């Protein structure tokens, strides 16, 4: 994909609604991963 044919694709991507999660983060001393989990109701796991 060169320059002039992906802007429409980006517009299409933005056109459809999306979900997101926000983060605020700082230095922790050692590089490490972050694992997220999605608890749901039923107890709760």
């Amino acid at each position: 994909w060169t320059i002039p044919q992906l802007e429409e694709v980006l517009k299409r991507q933005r056109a459809q609604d999306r979900l997101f999660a926000g983060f605020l983060l700082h230095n922790i001393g050692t590089s490490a991963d972050v694992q997220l989990f999605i608890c749901v109701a039923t107890e709760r796991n």
Binding site: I38, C39, V40, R44, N45
Partner: protein, 46 residues
């Protein structure tokens, strides 16, 4: 309404029952308190 023989028969028939018990070893913390206990499925591992 139960007499000596009545409570007797009750005790022998009760001795044969099969029960789930919680065994407690308590001592008191200087104040009256209560403990509520709950059971859950054996799931130790959504």
């Amino acid at each position: 309404g139960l007499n000596i023989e009545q409570l007797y028969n009750l005790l022998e028939q009760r001795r044969a029952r099969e029960r789930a018990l919680a065994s407690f070893t308590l001592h008191g913390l200087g104040f009256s308190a209560n403990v509520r206990i709950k059971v859950c499925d054996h799931d130790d591992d959504q």
